[PDB]
From a paper:
P-type ATPases, including ATP7A and ATP7B, are responsible for active copper efflux that is essential for maintaining copper homeostasis in mammalian cells. These two proteins are also known as Menkes (MNK) and Wilson (WLN) disease proteins, since dysfunction of ATP7A and ATP7B leads to these diseases, respectively. ATPases contain six metal-binding domains (MBDs) that share high sequence homology with Atox1, a chaperone delivering copper to ATPase, and exhibit similar copper-binding properties. In summary, tetrathiomolybdate (TM) can react with the metal-binding domain of ATPases (WLN4) and form a Mo2S6O2-centered protein dimer.
Since copper was not observed in the crystal structure of the TM-WLN4 complex, this indicates that the reaction with TM expelled copper ions from Cu-WLN4, suggesting the dimerization of WLN4 does not require copper ions. SEC-MALS analysis showed that incubation of apo-WLN4 with TM generated a product with a molecular weight of 15 kDa, indicating that reaction of apo-WLN4 also results in a protein dimer. The Fo – Fc maps of the Mo2S2O2 center also exhibit the same density features in both structures. These results further indicate that copper ions are not required for TM-mediated dimerization of WLN4. These results indicate that formation of the copper-free Mo2S6O2 core plays a pivotal role in the formation of the dimeric TM-WLN4 adduct, which is rather different from the reaction of the copper chaperone Atx1 that generates a copper-linked TM-Cu-Atx1 ternary adduct. In addition, this Mo-centered copper-free adduct could be more relevant in the case of WLN since ATPases in the cytoplasm exist in apo-form, and copper-bound ATPases are localized at the cell membrane.
Residue numbers in the entry:
A (entry chain A): 2 to 72
B (entry chain B): 1 to 72
The structure:
């Protein structure tokens, strides 16, 4: 319903991007996620009634990557 | 004598990569030791400067997929 761009630092293998996508995509309200390793971003399609970019960033950071919401 | 160089390494996020970097870089000719700090995002390398340069070490670390810069 909404889309957010999140900068994620230190994504340096495929396995981590899949972990990130796997974990984030399974959160309630998260419809879709695509990570770009080249950009260092995750684009997330989410339901703002349920989840926010700030909580997505927090979830990425609980996985151990520095993150910040871009837009 | 051997020289010491400090290399900042961006994007180390796991113990496994640390071990990989140390394992591969240590094998390079002229590299006595390398101590990677996951905490500080750096590597200290004790190396023979007649055999290998900091720029060569930086490049080798970058070939492993981490952005690296020689600091000191
Ligand atoms: Ca070590």
């Amino acid at each position: 319903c909404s889309t957010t761009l999140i900068a994620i630092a230190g994504m340096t293998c495929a396995s981590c991007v899949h972990s990130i996508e796997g974990m984030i995509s399974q959160l309630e309200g998260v419809q879709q996620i695509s990570v770009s390793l080249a950009e260092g971003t995750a684009t997330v399609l989410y339901n703002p009634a349920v989840i926010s970019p700030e909580e997505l960033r927090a979830a990425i950071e609980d996985m151990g990557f520095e993150a910040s919401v871009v837009s």
